[PDB]
Design an enzyme around this catalytic site. Structure first.
Site, mmCIF file in Angstrom:
data_model
loop_
_atom_site.group_PDB
_atom_site.id
_atom_site.type_symbol
_atom_site.label_atom_id
_atom_site.label_comp_id
_atom_site.label_asym_id
_atom_site.label_seq_id
_atom_site.Cartn_x
_atom_site.Cartn_y
_atom_site.Cartn_z
ATOM 1 N N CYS A 41 -32.326 18.947 -41.694
ATOM 2 C CA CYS A 41 -30.932 18.802 -41.308
ATOM 3 C C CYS A 41 -30.771 17.662 -40.311
ATOM 4 O O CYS A 41 -31.680 17.350 -39.537
ATOM 5 C CB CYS A 41 -30.412 20.107 -40.706
ATOM 6 S SG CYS A 41 -28.702 20.046 -40.163
ATOM 7 N N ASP A 43 -28.975 17.827 -37.809
ATOM 8 C CA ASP A 43 -28.977 18.434 -36.485
ATOM 9 C C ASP A 43 -30.293 18.173 -35.767
ATOM 10 O O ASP A 43 -30.300 17.819 -34.581
ATOM 11 C CB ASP A 43 -28.732 19.938 -36.599
ATOM 12 C CG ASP A 43 -27.285 20.274 -36.879
ATOM 13 O OD1 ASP A 43 -26.397 19.644 -36.271
ATOM 14 O OD2 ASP A 43 -27.035 21.162 -37.722
ATOM 15 N N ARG A 45 -32.545 20.151 -34.626
ATOM 16 C CA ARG A 45 -32.553 20.950 -33.403
ATOM 17 C C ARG A 45 -33.919 20.925 -32.737
ATOM 18 O O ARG A 45 -34.014 20.887 -31.507
ATOM 19 C CB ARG A 45 -32.130 22.388 -33.697
ATOM 20 C CG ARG A 45 -30.710 22.516 -34.203
ATOM 21 C CD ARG A 45 -29.758 21.774 -33.282
ATOM 22 N NE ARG A 45 -29.571 22.443 -32.000
ATOM 23 C CZ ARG A 45 -28.911 21.916 -30.977
ATOM 24 N NH1 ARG A 45 -28.367 20.712 -31.053
ATOM 25 N NH2 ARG A 45 -28.803 22.609 -29.848
ATOM 26 N N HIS A 97 -32.369 25.427 -40.670
ATOM 27 C CA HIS A 97 -32.448 26.068 -39.366
ATOM 28 C C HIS A 97 -31.252 26.985 -39.166
ATOM 29 O O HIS A 97 -30.110 26.581 -39.402
ATOM 30 C CB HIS A 97 -32.511 25.033 -38.238
ATOM 31 C CG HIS A 97 -31.337 24.109 -38.204
ATOM 32 N ND1 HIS A 97 -30.375 24.165 -37.219
ATOM 33 C CD2 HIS A 97 -30.972 23.100 -39.029
ATOM 34 C CE1 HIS A 97 -29.467 23.233 -37.440
ATOM 35 N NE2 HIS A 97 -29.806 22.573 -38.533
ATOM 36 N N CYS A 100 -27.135 26.498 -38.216
ATOM 37 C CA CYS A 100 -26.777 25.141 -38.605
ATOM 38 C C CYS A 100 -25.270 24.945 -38.557
ATOM 39 O O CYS A 100 -24.507 25.754 -39.091
ATOM 40 C CB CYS A 100 -27.309 24.855 -40.012
ATOM 41 S SG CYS A 100 -26.869 23.241 -40.690
HETATM 42 ZN ZN LIG Z 1 -28.020 21.965 -39.252
#
Ligand SMILES: [Zn+2]
Ligand SMILES: [Zn+2]
Ligand SMILES: [Zn+2]
Ligand SMILES: [Zn+2]
EC number: 4.2.1.1
Lengths: 213, 213, 213, 213
Positions: A41, A43, A45, A97, A100
């Site tokens: 993703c 993101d 993270r 994840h 998300c």
């Molecule tokens: Zn995500």
């Protein structure tokens, strides 16, 4: 943090390594060819290198919103074809994840603009498993869709012509679907690991049916 | 070599150890607000962006494709940028290439690699657009320059899309930067095309080309 | 003319044919494997069958705004690949039309929304040949860009892996660049007809040189 | 090579009309913004103007293999956005045709190359309604999937941000799903005509429910 702040950190990090191992940079140069493809993703993270202990140079990385592999996205498909056919990576990892932002935005359907069209591929998965998610309590649905999406993207990846061509010509490539949470950072294997066309099917079907329990 | 079992095991260890050292670290992730940067980089990811810039997980929206392209009609990258600019409201977008890129080199040597060749044709277009410039330089001094040219063009493309034009037109603060780094030392070089609005996007691009000539 | 009109017009046309020419559907019933691919504008001011006198069944048609062939558009590329590799077309015709709304919007650059990104590929052609357009009379610039745009798409078409592979394996495919005006419907051959890699190169440059005069 | 045949037919057809009906080119010269958008198959077994009796200039036409409307295909989406937002068409017609070569290839899944990735969107439809098609005799499945694909593409079209934004601003746009056969050329209305988001939902469900029996 401003741009100059990040720039200064780069120069320091550069110096520190030279002082300790001035050969490190040399190493990467001759770091072979990555053997793993990470589809994650945007993101990010937790970056893939911290999660897996993989060093710079053994990871080919692509990231889009909610780690999608759409049948007609030449971006992701060029990554897959270049990794599989040119670099000859032996493992492709699709990792989502929990929590998300894209997957939740897909469900709540707010007017976010151009991104809503991209998230419709996830909403298709939401309704595709409308029955399965119905059997579960509401709170545990957004996390399950996140795992559902990862299984679907693998299915897709295994159906693309790039993967189908490699398996039929005997190339050894394996697709894996993982997920990790920001509560512990622990990778969970979703058990959709495929090495050929037949395993891709059986793994996907069993993956869904197992969630029914 | 390193197998999947290693990566899974590395994750469980890294996870437990962290709980030992900072059990709040995973809570921080949550609190961590929306990111402030968009990193558009190459799928080679020879050095991950977080180590290069000292940015910790949660301050980076990350997208990666072969040779870090921003094609006018690639919905993948455009969906990422729109989600970052309009939803996440990033204030800095960094397009970063890397000298020695396999894609840029494949673009120039033009081998028959398959599906990826179509993606790389956008780079060959940048090759002929500045065919005059590259002629004035010694052969050795060309492959690195195209890598810098490609990054400036992608910064140019990013600023011309409707997403950036709309944000700048409505007064939102977004800044686009073009960088490059080498695997010889890991030092980021700023290609000096930093844009904050429509006029600066052109002026800097105008300013960039001439100094390299 | 409304929807109900179109439904009713169809029913009349259907029986009239059965009454008058019951063999029309017989031709449609046979194989009728196409030999031509028409890549044209979505304006479709004059349909391709009317311009060429071609009968139903011998035309494979794709249409987008301003008849573009983008290196990374899986839509157009899938049509071409299906035509060249499966349908085995022997001629591909890329045809623009004077007065095109897309070419005009590209130059005037109004804020039209999502379409502006598609039209940015045309502005690339506008600045690439800024030299030519400056030397020519003002009124004939938008018509020339329309001719430039068609020549560039033929160039792009020949650069794709689909065409490069087919020509390298000896398949007979010929690409043509045409244009027509709304004043008379007369097709003008832009003289960039390519049958292999070498013809594609010279014809292109050639094409550009006479326009300079 | 019949290019010369087509070339003369144009010139012939051009003078014929100029001599006989010089207003044909006058009508086409008239700035008639279309009121209909036609999204049809690239087969174009019967041109849209012949099926509907529509004259040159009131039809905006887009064609891809098996008349797909993919959530992330910027090609088709740029056409739709330009029609709805700039040209302000009042009707969008998605029309398939029984016997479509693309729809058949999706089911039989032969190794055709790059086009197979495009057709996976149809195979998605085939498995999504595995129950419906299973209850029917094998003979009646390829025609049903052809109608199923048209309903789904109308479903996809109505969900895109272009349609959702246009409907929310009160603009009058209507989406229609049709099909025609090569046996008679008669348009069959699949009864998924939508004028807002709520009707799109009800129309789609009723369309599938009616096919159940
Ligand atoms: Zn995500
Ligand atoms: Zn690279
Ligand atoms: Zn046009
Ligand atoms: Zn068809």
């Amino acid at each position: 943090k401003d741009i100059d702040t990040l720039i200064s950190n780069n120069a320091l990090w550069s110096k520190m390594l030279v002082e300790e191992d001035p050969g490190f940079f040399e190493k990467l140069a001759q770091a072979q060819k990555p053997r793993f493809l990470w589809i994650g993703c945007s993101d990010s993270r937790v970056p893939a290198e911290r999660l897996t202990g993989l060093e710079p140079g053994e990871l080919f990385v692509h990231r889009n919103v909610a780690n999608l592999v759409i049948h007609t996205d030449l971006n992701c498909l060029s990554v897959v074809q270049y990794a599989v056919d040119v670099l000859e990576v032996e493992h492709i990892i699709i990792c989502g994840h929990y929590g998300c932002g894209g997957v939740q935005a897909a469900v709540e359907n707010p007017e976010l603009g151009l991104i809503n069209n991209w998230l419709l591929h996830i909403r298709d998965i939401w309704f595709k498993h409308s029955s399965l998610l119905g059997e579960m309590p509401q709170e545990r649905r957004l996390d399950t869709l996140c795992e559902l999406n990862v299984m679907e993207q693998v299915y897709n990846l295994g159906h693309s012509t790039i993967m189908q061509s490699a398996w039929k010509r005997g190339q050894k490539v394996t697709i894996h679907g993982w997920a990790y949470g920001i509560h512990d950072g622990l990778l969970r294997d979703l058990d959709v690991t495929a090495t050929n066309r037949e395993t891709l099917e059986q793994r996907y079907r069993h993956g869904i049916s197992n969630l029914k329990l």
